[PDB]
Amino acid sequence: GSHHHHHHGSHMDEKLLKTIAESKYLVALTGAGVSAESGIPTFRGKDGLWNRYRPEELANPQAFAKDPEKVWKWYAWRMEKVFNAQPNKAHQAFAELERLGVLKCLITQNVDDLHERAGSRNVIHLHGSLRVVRCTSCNNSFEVESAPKIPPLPKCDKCGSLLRPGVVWFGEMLPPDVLDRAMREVERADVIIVAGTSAVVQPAASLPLIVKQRGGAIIEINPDETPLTPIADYSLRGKAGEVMDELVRHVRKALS
Amino acid sequence: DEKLLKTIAESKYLVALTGAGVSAESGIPTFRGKDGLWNRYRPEELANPQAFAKDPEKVWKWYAWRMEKVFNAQPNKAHQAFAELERLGVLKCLITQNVDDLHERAGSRNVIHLHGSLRVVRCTSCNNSFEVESAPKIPPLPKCDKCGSLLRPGVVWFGEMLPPDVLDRAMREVERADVIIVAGTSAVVQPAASLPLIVKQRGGAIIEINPDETPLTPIADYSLRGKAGEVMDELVRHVRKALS
Ligand SMILES: NC(=O)c1ccc[n+]([C@@H]2O[C@H](COP(=O)([O-])OP(=O)(O)OC[C@H]3O[C@@H](n4cnc5c(N)ncnc54)[C@H](O)[C@@H]3O)[C@@H](O)[C@H]2O)c1
Ligand SMILES: NC(=O)c1ccc[n+]([C@@H]2O[C@H](COP(=O)([O-])OP(=O)(O)OC[C@H]3O[C@@H](n4cnc5c(N)ncnc54)[C@H](O)[C@@H]3O)[C@@H](O)[C@H]2O)c1
Ligand SMILES: [Zn+2]
Ligand SMILES: [Zn+2]
C-alpha cells in the first residue's frame, strides 16, 4: 500500500548488471508485450479483428464449441500475422543472452514463435503455440508453415474430427509436462527477468513468486507497473526492445 | 483378357489395394517371414508395440534400415501404372497396406495409407508428428525436439487400431467401387484382406495381380500370375489404347 511501499531500482545501474552477470541460474518469463514491437499488438481487451469481443470470449473452449468457424477465423488471422512478423530487438536480446550462457531457460506465455525464430533454443510454451494445430478428439498433433484458409474447417486426417489451435485456453488445464518443467526451472532460478507481461493471468503470474521465496531476484521490464512490481527488486519502465537491447550490450561487455 | 481389359475400361468406379509386392521391383523385398536385416525374426516380432517398449533401439534400427532403403528407392512400373490409371480417370482411389511412399512419389493423388507411413515420425509422449527426408542414424534413440521424449515410426503395428477416419474412408471406397485391382498382397493380413470381399458382395469384380495364389484367388474374377510391374504396365497401355 501507500503505507507499505516497497522500493525497487529503476535503472540500468551497476548492481543490476552485476546481478544478471553474476547469476548462477537466470531464467525469463515473457508476456505479449515482448512481441508488440514485432507488429503483434497486445489486445488491450479487444479481439483486434471484429473488435467487439474481449480476447477471452474467443480463446475459450465453450466459444470454440459454439462457433468453431469464428474462433478459427480469429486464429487464422492471428497465425498469418505472427508467421509474417519478425523477431524484434527483445527476442534477439533474449536469444543472445542464452547464447552467452547466462539465460538458462525462457518460459513464455506467448503463442507466437518469435523467441524460436530469434534463435532461442530453450523455450517453454506455457500456453501452447500458434504453430501447432491439434485434434479436438484424438491425440494427433502437428506444426504448420502457414495459416489455414477457413472457408472449410480443418479436419483431422486420423479421426475425421475438428482440428483446433494448439494453444491453452482459459478453462483448460496446462499440459502437465509443460507445467512441471516450468516449475522446476523457477525452483532452480536465482534470478528471473519478467518482461512484457501484465502479471495477472495465472499460474504464470505466480512463477516469479517462487524465485522470490527461494531468495532469488526479480527483474521486471514493463512500461506499466503491475501486481508484480511491489515485489520486484528492479522494475524498468520501458519497452522490452530498447531495454533488453541496452541490457544485453552491457552484460556482453562486462561478461568479457 | 479382352473381357478383363473391358471390365477395367468400362468400370464406373475402380479402386485398388496394394501390398508389399508392388514395391518389390523397386528394390524393396517382401519379407517372407524374415526381417531381412538380421534374418532372425518374423517381421511381426519387430513391428510390435511390446517389442518397441522392450527394446526401442532394436526396433528403431530395423526401421532406420527400412527407411534408408525406401527413401533411396525409385517408384517402379506398377506405381507409375497406377498413377497413370488415375490420370486417365479410371482409378478413383488407391488403398495401400505399404508404409513406403512410392505411390504418391509416382504421382498418385488419392492414396489411403491403411498402415501409416515410414515418412512419418511422431513423439510417443507429446504426440507431435512430422515427416522426414532422411533416415536416422541410431547411435542414439531418436528424440522429440519439443519435449525430448522418444520418437517412434508413424506406422500402425499389429495390436494397434488403424486411424478410424482412415479405416472409415477405405470402407466407403470399397462399398462404392464396382471393380478392384488387388496387387502385391498375400491377402492374409486383416482388415485389408477383407476389403475386396465388400466389393464382391456388392456385385463388383476383383482383379488379382500376384505371382502366387492367395486366399483371395477363389473369389477373384481375374487372377494374373505375374509381377505387378510388368502386368500393370501392359494393362495400363491397353486401357489407354482402348480409351484412345
Ligand atoms: N492480451 C490479452 O488481451 C489477453 C486477453 C485475455 C486472455 N489473455 C491471456 O493472458 C495471458 C497473459 O498475457 P500477457 O500478460 O502476456 O499480455 P497482456 O496483454 O495482458 O499484457 C502485456 C503487457 O506488456 C506490456 N507492454 C506493452 N508494450 C510493451 C513493450 N514494448 N515492451 C514490454 N512490455 C510491453 C503491457 O503494459 C502489459 O503489461 C496470455 O498469454 C493470454 O493467454 C490475453
Ligand atoms: N511382409 C511381411 O512379412 C509382413 C509380416 C507380418 C506383418 N506384415 C504386415 O502385413 C501387411 C500386408 O503385407 P502384404 O500382403 O502387402 O505383404 P506380404 O509380404 O505378406 O505379401 C506380398 C505379396 O506380393 C506378392 N509379390 C511378390 N513380388 C511381387 C511382384 N513383383 N508383383 C506383385 N506381387 C508380388 C507375393 O507373392 C505376396 O502375395 C503389411 O502392410 C505389414 O503391415 C507384413
Ligand atoms: Zn483426430
Ligand atoms: Zn514430444
| B23 three-class SS | helix
Check whether B66 is labelled as a binding-site residue: yes
Q: Nearest by CB to A159, which of B130, B147, B165? A: B165
DSSP H stretches of helix in A23-147: 61-66, 68-84, 89-99, 114-118
Check whether A105 is labelled as a binding-site residue: no
Task: Map out the domains of chain B with their CATH numbers.
Answer: 1-27+75-115+162-244 (3.40.50.1220), 28-74+116-161 (3.30.1600.10)
What cell does B55 get? 527394446
Closest CA to B75 of B45, B111, B116: B111
Using a CB–CB cutoff of 8 Å, tell me whether B163 touches chain A. Answer: yes
Question: Obtained via which technique?
Answer: X-ray
With 0-12 / 13-18 / 19 or more C-beta atoms within 10 angstroms meaning exposed / middle / buried, residue B85 is buried
- Contact at 8 Å (CB) between B184 and B24? yes
Partner-chain contact B127 A143, CB within 8 Å = no
Distance CA B177, CA B175 (A): 6
Using a CB–CB cutoff of 8 Å, tell me whether B161 touches chain A. Answer: no
Nearest CA to ligand 1 atom 17: A32
Resolution (A): 2.1
Q: If you ran DSSP here, which 8-state letter would residue A168 be given?
A: P
Using a CB–CB cutoff of 8 Å, tell me whether A175 touches chain B. Answer: yes
Active-site residue, A91 included: no
- The residue among B146, B156, B166, B168 with the most chain A CBs within 10 A of its CB, best to mutate, is B146
Closest CA to A222 of A20, A48, A31: A31
DSSP H stretches of helix in chain A: 14-21, 61-66, 68-84, 89-99, 114-118, 176-186, 207-213, 240-254
Catalytic annotation, pick one of B79, B103, B113, B115: B115
Looking from the CA of residue A126, the nearest atom of ligand 1 is: 41
Nearest CA to ligand 2 atom 2: B31
Partner-chain contact A177 B147, CB within 8 Å = yes
- Contact at 8 Å (CB) between A196 and A36? yes
With 0-12 / 13-18 / 19 or more C-beta atoms within 10 angstroms meaning exposed / middle / buried, residue B238 is middle
For residue A186, the distance in angstroms to the closest alpha carbon of chain B comes to: 18
Residue B191, preceding peptide bond in cis (omega within 30° of 0): yes
